[PDB]
From Swiss-Prot:
Cytoplasmic domain ranges by topology: 34-42, 185-283
Family: Belongs to the G-protein coupled receptor 1 family.
Disulfide bonds: 81-146
Bilayer topology term: Multi-pass membrane protein
Organism expressing this protein natively: Homo sapiens (Human)
Molecular function terms from GO: cysteinyl leukotriene receptor activity; G protein-coupled peptide receptor activity; leukotriene receptor activity
Protein known as: Cysteinyl leukotriene receptor 2
Superkingdom of the source species: Eukaryota
Keywords from the named record: Cell membrane, Disulfide bond, G-protein coupled receptor, Glycoprotein, Membrane, Receptor, Transducer, Transmembrane, Transmembrane helix
Gene: CYSLTR2
Swiss-Prot/TrEMBL GO biological process terms: immune response; neuropeptide signaling pathway
Extracellular side: 64-93, 140-163, 305-324
């Protein structure tokens, strides 16, 4: 079949690229995750678990590459061949679940009604164990054609596919869709409220900026304090305190100095606004990247995988569908080197921590 020549030319290249990009990205990421960072949240745990899984899977891609460079011949043993499948599917579904967990955690962080480090490790251990246990029949106590689909494997894999498709791909993707919905909702409502607070404060600052006497400045500062009342919370409302100082000046009759005080109070409020809007932005970013990962890496692969299993026959080549499966399989594997784009653009000050970790 034509697809066999295609795979022999295609997989060595893509796998070894994924290996090179993935060892670099994950080793660097893991190094950053293991270095001490004071304000490190449970996010750090989930990313780290993902990174480690991704790296363990990447350590197998040379062997796969080897298989195809030899003309689809597995020279390693039966056990290494079983480990190929075991690593591939454990890493796949572990990754999907850590990513789902990371989006959920990041949503909870914006809403905050926390995941501690120890709890994050327990949740990770449970994910590891459930998925390793679900996968052990890939390790059953032919092999020359290690990575192929054959007629003895097809009956088991049809049943295995049903369950892995539903529970390991569609259920987490559904969870991600709900997460996106919830994050958009929270972000829009919170940003509407932040606009209203900013605008009330700016109204009163404009009033104070052109006020006739000290009583008027005092009244508008009082209204400002009423607006300031109602996750760092601006160092326990630092702006609200500075306003109290300005109100003292007002009650002393110092109009010019109270106006001067009010006019630098414009910026300390948007400091608060941003300290609590950056978490909402982190969650939006996490969910958008993760959904792109699903649409690129996992959903086409599970679709075509299912159709391939369903329509498979030992005599027929099925070249277009099989080639589409091969390319989507490559994208499922490439996820292991994609995941640091998440770490970098949606980690916890990851660019800062990288700069600090590499500087001599
Ligand atoms: O190269 C090529 O020509 C193309 C690929 C050939 N090829 C090679 C073959 C191969 O591997 O050798 O695989 C296929 C499959 N495999 C599956 O359809 C499957 C379905 C399920 C499955 O489950 C593993 C354990 C999952 C445990 C789990 C985790 C969860 F998170 C939730 C539930 C569960 Cl149960 C493994 C494979 C389907 C179609 C083709 C092949
Ligand atoms: C991944 C895919 C399926 C995402 C689904 C897209 C649609 C169905 C989602 C994405 C954003 C969602 C909206 C987000 C915000 C709100 C405000 C809320 O007070 C009413 C529901 C409403 C209007 C949601 C409706 C459903 C919604 C439009
Ligand atoms: C040939 C086979 C190749 C295999 C390649 C080896 C893969 C393992 C690499 C790094 C492990 C990192 C160990 C991570 C330990 C995490 C626990 C921890 O130390 O805590 C983390 C953080 O500091 C507080 O939560
Ligand atoms: C980016 C990496 C893309 C690699 C694809 C190589 C295709 C080789 C082929 O089709 O023969
Ligand atoms: C930056 C590292 C990323 C590595 C990504 C590897 C995944 C490759 C996925 C898609 C590439 C598609 C190439 C298709 C070539 C078709 C050739 C042909 O039709 O004969
Ligand atoms: C140590 C792993 C050996 C296998 C090679 C894999 C690539 C290296 C990946 C991560 C190396 C991290 C180095 C150890 C950091 C210890 C934590 C610390 O520095 O405090
Ligand atoms: C690590 C080595 C990277 C290149 C792997 C080549 C595997 C092979 O011999 O085909
Ligand atoms: C994930 C790639 C395939 C590896 C098979 C199972 C790996 C389990 C090893 C280490 C889990 C680390 C726990 C932290
Ligand atoms: C398969 C090969 C095995 C891979 C080995 C990777 C496991 C390494 C470290 C696992 C970390 C477990 C530490 C628990 C965290 C302790 C804590 O709660 O602070
Ligand atoms: C096997 C599971 C290994 C994965 C994570 C280990 C963390 C266990 C929690 C210790 C506290
Ligand atoms: C999120 C909710 C997920 C709902 C899933 C319900 C049904 C999905 C069934 C997928 C069908 C796979 C067919 C595989 C086969 O026929 O062997
Ligand atoms: C969002 C996640 C839910 C997505 C899809 C629901 C399940 C769709 C599966 C259709 C199954 C067709 C069949 O019965 O064979
Ligand atoms: C498919 C999952 C099974 C149905 C469970 C119901 C999920 C619907 C809404 C959950 C939203 C929770 C956010 C608060
Ligand atoms: C919200 C940010 C947009 C979502 C990401 C879109 C495309 C993927 C590119 C990832 C890098 C952009 C992230 C920008 C950022 O850090 O806010
Ligand atoms: C979002 C990005 C989606 C891109 C996925 C990449 C390749 C999938 C191509 C699927 C083609 C299916 C129709 C061809 C066929 O199999 O007959
Ligand atoms: C087929 C579509 C090709 C997409 C390949 C790489 C894009 C994602 C890289 C991150
Ligand atoms: C060799 C086996 C594969 C190792 C690949 C690991 C790649 C990057 C690991 C990161 C090491 C970072 C240490 C930098 C020194 C420093 O702290 O300044």
């Amino acid at each position: 079949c034509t697809i066999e020549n295609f795979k022999r030319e295609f997989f060595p290249i893509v796998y070894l690229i994924i290996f090179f990009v993935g060892v670099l990205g994950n080793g660097l990421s893991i190094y950053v995750f293991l270095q001490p960072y004071k304000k490190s949240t449970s996010v750090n745990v989930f990313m780290l678990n993902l990174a480690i899984s991704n790296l363990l899977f990447i350590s197998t891609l040379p062997f796969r590459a080897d298989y195809y460079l030899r003309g689809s011949n597995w020279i390693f043993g039966d056990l290494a061949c079983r480990i190929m499948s075991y690593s591939l599917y454990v890493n796949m579904y572990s990754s999907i679940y850590f990513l789902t967990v990371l989006s959920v955690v990041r949503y909870l962080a914006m809403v905050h009604p926390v995941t501690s480090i120890r709890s994050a490790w327990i949740l990770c251990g449970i994910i590891w164990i459930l998925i390793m246990a679900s996968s052990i029949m890939l390790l059953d106590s032919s092999v020359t054609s290690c990575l192929e689909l054959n007629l003895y494997k097809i009956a088991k894999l049809q049943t295995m596919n049903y369950i892995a498709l539903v529970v390991g791909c569609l259920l987490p993707f559904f969870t991600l869709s709900i997460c996106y919905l919830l994050i958009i909702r929270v972000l829009l409502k919170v940003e509407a409220d932040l606009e209203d607070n900013w605008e009330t404060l700016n109204d009163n600052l404009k009033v104070i900026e052109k006020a006739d006497n000290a009583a008027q400045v005092k009244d508008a500062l009082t209204k400002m304090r009423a607006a300031a009342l109602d996750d760092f919370r601006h160092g326990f409302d630092i702006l609200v305190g500075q306003i109290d100082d300005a109100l003292k000046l007002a009650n002393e009759g110092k109009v010019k100095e109270a106006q001067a005080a009010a006019e630098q109070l414009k910026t300390t409020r948007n400091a608060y606004i941003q300290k609590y809007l950056v978490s909402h932005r982190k969650a939006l970013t996490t969910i958008i990247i993760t959904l792109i990962i699903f649409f690129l890496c996992f959903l086409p692969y599970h679709t075509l995988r299912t159709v391939h299993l369903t329509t498979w026959k030992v005599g027929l080549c099925k070249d277009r569908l099989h080639k589409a499966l091969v390319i989507t399989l490559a994208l499922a594997a490439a996820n292991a080197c994609f995941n640091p784009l998440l770490y970098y653009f949606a980690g916890e000050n990851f660019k800062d921590r990288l700069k600090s970790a590499l500087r001599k």
